[PDB]
Write an enzyme that holds these catalytic residues in place. Sequence first.
Site, mmCIF file in Angstrom:
data_model
loop_
_atom_site.group_PDB
_atom_site.id
_atom_site.type_symbol
_atom_site.label_atom_id
_atom_site.label_comp_id
_atom_site.label_asym_id
_atom_site.label_seq_id
_atom_site.Cartn_x
_atom_site.Cartn_y
_atom_site.Cartn_z
ATOM 1 N N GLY A 68 41.953 43.625 44.803
ATOM 2 C CA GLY A 68 41.107 42.438 44.739
ATOM 3 C C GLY A 68 39.665 42.929 44.793
ATOM 4 O O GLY A 68 38.803 42.312 45.398
ATOM 5 N N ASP A 95 42.480 45.459 40.315
ATOM 6 C CA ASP A 95 42.239 44.026 40.158
ATOM 7 C C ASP A 95 42.588 43.745 38.703
ATOM 8 O O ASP A 95 42.497 44.649 37.865
ATOM 9 C CB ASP A 95 40.742 43.757 40.385
ATOM 10 C CG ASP A 95 40.424 42.305 40.631
ATOM 11 O OD1 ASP A 95 40.724 41.445 39.788
ATOM 12 O OD2 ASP A 95 39.827 42.034 41.679
ATOM 13 N N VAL A 116 48.448 43.274 41.095
ATOM 14 C CA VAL A 116 49.543 43.921 41.788
ATOM 15 C C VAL A 116 50.675 42.989 42.223
ATOM 16 O O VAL A 116 50.459 41.821 42.545
ATOM 17 C CB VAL A 116 49.042 44.683 43.041
ATOM 18 C CG1 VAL A 116 47.792 45.496 42.707
ATOM 19 C CG2 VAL A 116 48.784 43.714 44.183
ATOM 20 N N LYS A 169 41.560 40.166 54.225
ATOM 21 C CA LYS A 169 40.847 38.899 54.152
ATOM 22 C C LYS A 169 41.679 37.918 55.019
ATOM 23 O O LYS A 169 42.906 37.881 54.885
ATOM 24 C CB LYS A 169 40.874 38.466 52.703
ATOM 25 C CG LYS A 169 40.105 37.255 52.351
ATOM 26 C CD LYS A 169 40.677 36.764 51.050
ATOM 27 C CE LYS A 169 39.769 35.767 50.371
ATOM 28 N NZ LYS A 169 38.510 36.448 49.999
ATOM 29 N N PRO A 173 44.837 28.570 57.566
ATOM 30 C CA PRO A 173 44.920 27.296 56.853
ATOM 31 C C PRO A 173 44.396 26.195 57.791
ATOM 32 O O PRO A 173 44.470 26.318 59.027
ATOM 33 C CB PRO A 173 46.420 27.152 56.596
ATOM 34 C CG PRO A 173 46.840 28.579 56.379
ATOM 35 C CD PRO A 173 46.131 29.279 57.527
ATOM 36 N N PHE A 174 43.844 25.137 57.219
ATOM 37 C CA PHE A 174 43.323 24.041 58.026
ATOM 38 C C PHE A 174 44.488 23.197 58.553
ATOM 39 O O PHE A 174 45.388 22.844 57.795
ATOM 40 C CB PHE A 174 42.355 23.203 57.196
ATOM 41 C CG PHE A 174 41.228 24.004 56.623
ATOM 42 C CD1 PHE A 174 40.468 24.830 57.446
ATOM 43 C CD2 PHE A 174 40.955 23.972 55.259
ATOM 44 C CE1 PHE A 174 39.463 25.611 56.931
ATOM 45 C CE2 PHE A 174 39.940 24.759 54.725
ATOM 46 C CZ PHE A 174 39.198 25.579 55.563
ATOM 47 N N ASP A 176 45.005 20.120 59.088
ATOM 48 C CA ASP A 176 45.336 18.928 58.318
ATOM 49 C C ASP A 176 46.034 19.261 56.993
ATOM 50 O O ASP A 176 46.306 18.380 56.181
ATOM 51 C CB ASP A 176 44.093 18.054 58.090
ATOM 52 C CG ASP A 176 43.081 18.681 57.130
ATOM 53 O OD1 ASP A 176 43.128 19.913 56.898
ATOM 54 O OD2 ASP A 176 42.216 17.927 56.617
ATOM 55 N N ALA A 200 35.243 29.681 57.414
ATOM 56 C CA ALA A 200 36.047 30.000 58.586
ATOM 57 C C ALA A 200 36.732 31.355 58.384
ATOM 58 O O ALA A 200 37.625 31.731 59.147
ATOM 59 C CB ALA A 200 37.083 28.923 58.801
ATOM 60 N N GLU A 227 39.683 26.470 63.536
ATOM 61 C CA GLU A 227 38.792 25.474 62.965
ATOM 62 C C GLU A 227 37.624 25.112 63.873
ATOM 63 O O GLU A 227 36.469 25.152 63.457
ATOM 64 C CB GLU A 227 39.596 24.219 62.640
ATOM 65 C CG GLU A 227 38.768 23.019 62.258
ATOM 66 C CD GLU A 227 39.619 21.792 62.037
ATOM 67 O OE1 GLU A 227 39.887 21.066 63.027
ATOM 68 O OE2 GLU A 227 40.026 21.578 60.872
HETATM 69 N N1 LIG Z 1 47.658 40.490 42.805
HETATM 70 C C1 LIG Z 1 46.369 40.786 42.690
HETATM 71 N N2 LIG Z 1 46.035 42.047 42.514
HETATM 72 C C2 LIG Z 1 44.770 42.385 42.402
HETATM 73 N N3 LIG Z 1 43.711 41.649 42.433
HETATM 74 C C3 LIG Z 1 44.068 40.357 42.605
HETATM 75 C C4 LIG Z 1 45.334 39.848 42.737
HETATM 76 N N4 LIG Z 1 45.299 38.438 42.881
HETATM 77 C C5 LIG Z 1 44.018 38.134 42.836
HETATM 78 N N5 LIG Z 1 43.199 39.270 42.673
HETATM 79 C C6 LIG Z 1 41.722 39.399 42.622
HETATM 80 O O1 LIG Z 1 41.154 38.974 43.866
HETATM 81 C C7 LIG Z 1 39.752 38.897 43.529
HETATM 82 C C8 LIG Z 1 39.037 37.904 44.439
HETATM 83 S S1 LIG Z 1 37.235 38.016 44.366
HETATM 84 C C9 LIG Z 1 37.064 39.698 44.980
HETATM 85 C C10 LIG Z 1 35.626 40.239 45.014
HETATM 86 C C11 LIG Z 1 35.570 41.746 45.244
HETATM 87 N N6 LIG Z 1 36.198 42.055 46.515
HETATM 88 C C12 LIG Z 1 34.134 42.265 45.180
HETATM 89 O O2 LIG Z 1 33.776 43.061 46.071
HETATM 90 O O3 LIG Z 1 33.349 41.797 44.313
HETATM 91 C C13 LIG Z 1 39.691 38.484 42.057
HETATM 92 O O4 LIG Z 1 38.979 39.476 41.285
HETATM 93 C C14 LIG Z 1 41.115 38.436 41.689
HETATM 94 O O5 LIG Z 1 41.394 38.800 40.271
HETATM 95 C C1 LIG Z 2 35.644 24.768 56.802
HETATM 96 N N1 LIG Z 2 36.636 23.699 56.823
HETATM 97 C C2 LIG Z 2 37.066 23.049 55.733
HETATM 98 C C3 LIG Z 2 38.045 22.003 55.673
HETATM 99 C C4 LIG Z 2 38.624 21.598 56.888
HETATM 100 N N2 LIG Z 2 39.558 20.659 56.979
HETATM 101 N N3 LIG Z 2 38.182 22.242 57.989
HETATM 102 C C5 LIG Z 2 37.264 23.216 57.908
HETATM 103 O O1 LIG Z 2 36.902 23.819 59.106
#
Ligand SMILES: Nc1ncnc2c1ncn2[C@@H]1O[C@H](CSCC[C@H](N)C(=O)O)[C@@H](O)[C@H]1O
Ligand SMILES: Cn1ccc(N)nc1=O
Lengths: 291, 291
Positions: A68, A95, A116, A169, A173-174, A176, A200, A227
Amino acid sequence: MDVVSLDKPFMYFEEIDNELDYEPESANEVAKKLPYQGQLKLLLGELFFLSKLQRHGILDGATVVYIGSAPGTHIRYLRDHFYNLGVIIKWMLIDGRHHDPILNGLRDVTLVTRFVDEEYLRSIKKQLHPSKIILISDVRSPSTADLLSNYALQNVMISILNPVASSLKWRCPFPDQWIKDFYIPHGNKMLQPFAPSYSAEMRLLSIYTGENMRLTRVTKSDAVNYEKKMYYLNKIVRNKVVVNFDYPNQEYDYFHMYFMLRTVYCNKTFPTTKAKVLFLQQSIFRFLNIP
Amino acid sequence: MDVVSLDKPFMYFEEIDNELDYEPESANEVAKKLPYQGQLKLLLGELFFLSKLQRHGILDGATVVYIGSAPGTHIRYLRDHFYNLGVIIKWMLIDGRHHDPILNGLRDVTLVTRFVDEEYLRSIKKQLHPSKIILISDVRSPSTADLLSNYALQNVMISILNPVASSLKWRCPFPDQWIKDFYIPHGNKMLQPFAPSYSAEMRLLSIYTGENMRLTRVTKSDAVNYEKKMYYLNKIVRNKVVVNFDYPNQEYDYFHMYFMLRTVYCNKTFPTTKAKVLFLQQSIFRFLNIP
Ligand SMILES: Nc1ncnc2c1ncn2[C@@H]1O[C@H](CSCC[C@H](N)C(=O)O)[C@@H](O)[C@H]1O
Ligand SMILES: Cn1ccc(N)nc1=O
Ligand SMILES: Nc1ncnc2c1ncn2[C@@H]1O[C@H](CSCC[C@H](N)C(=O)O)[C@@H](O)[C@H]1O
Ligand SMILES: Cn1ccc(N)nc1=O
């Protein structure tokens, strides 16, 4: 002006000592104030994570598999910094999108245009063997369904690649939009200066000892806590001007950035940490073309 | 006669202090010497596991979800033993096959004729809520592919059910049939007296603290170690007559059984452990109709 005095900034999620009911009206507010802020956000966090591994002696000789990674403009800076420090690292950027051409022509960085899947992780594991792997993931599909799917893939990245450390990363999840409980790797939840205004998202940093893999269940009640703690940090904290921070910029994010940058290693010797940081920040902003 | 003197028996896998190259000719050898030996094998292990939980105060008030429970003849004994001790437990026996009719008509035991899948685990989790769950799994499909599939399902049993403790069937795939590395829950590898003559199967016993779930990767080299340690235990150890074991039967398995039974709680008070054990063994053998 919103002024305050702080000792240190919240470096990790568990340090956040207060919460606020999320106000959906915040979503309409300006998310970013700086050009290329997203590259800056990623650069600071990965610089922090990687300097830590260097500190533990686990960076030199590793292959960093960044999935990614595209466009990855900021990755060029990271690559130069360690390369210029004498640390030997091979970069494997995968990517489906295209990477910034500044990454081309470096013998130490391999760019791969492939989305991937589990099967692919297996072939790259066989091909990287027997090099030690450091995983950095920033993949993006979003719905809670999209998130769960991303997190599920991130856990399979770790189980197949079997890395010595990882930066994933992470945004819960929120509540709600809760679907079901799930597991994420145990790690330190590193907070991100320069993240969008109400984001968040944080980065899960892990170091793998032995042949064990510890996971942690995430429930809706955890989601509620994420949240509120993140909303408090965003709405209140990040909006503070740390007046006791004698630095060209006293805004919370710069105060927070200072603490991450102070852990970074440089070739040049400085009389004070302030001088090193000012230097690293200047360098970073110049590179990203940020005023 | 193959005589020897032993302090204690190997209770867990990690205690086995020697290994032997596996001889495929062993597979043609008599696997069992006792009638209903398989029920005996399971009864001793689950009695051991459950008495431990009782010791930790985590049994009373729990619902034991036993998947792969049919026929389950020996489960009736387990049920009576704790029921007669005053421990309150609800049993939920799920299998696609039919259970021994001796299990019918007990308000504390629910029999379910269903092969479980992930979706079903979810509905039973919702229905058992909010009771504390103790998982016992003995499901059977075999090929390494069959094994991996079983182990994958067992891990999903734990993630969805979120039990306070678990006993899982565990036999490492044979190295000459390795497919891929995989993860299994961290736990104590309890060795089984009365297992078939050359069985490499053990029971993985785990207790879940906090909201964490620790796993462990299993490699082909681990597989080689399992094979050799288990072959040594089977070929050499289990064939020993513990002459310093003053007991009606001095064979290794009875010596091993003695150590498991001594941890079992009884209502009746005995002057010595030997007397309690002889009693528990007699009782167990009478129940299973073993001479
Ligand atoms: N299975 C997968 N394998 C590789 N990349 C993936 C993926 N699913 C999503 N992505 C990639 O995840 C990225 C999110 S944006 C990533 C920004 C990057 N880290 C930078 O430094 O600029 C996208 O480019 C998307 O194509
Ligand atoms: C940032 N954000 C967005 C949607 C949601 N329900 N809560 C949040 O904290
Ligand atoms: N998904 C599944 N759910 C439930 N039981 C399953 C299963 N897959 C296989 N099984 C059961 O696993 C069992 C293996 S034999 C089990 C013997 C039992 N533990 C006793 O004490 O007698 C079989 O009855 C089989 O039907
Ligand atoms: C028990 N057993 C069976 C087959 C095999 N290859 N090895 C073994 O240890």
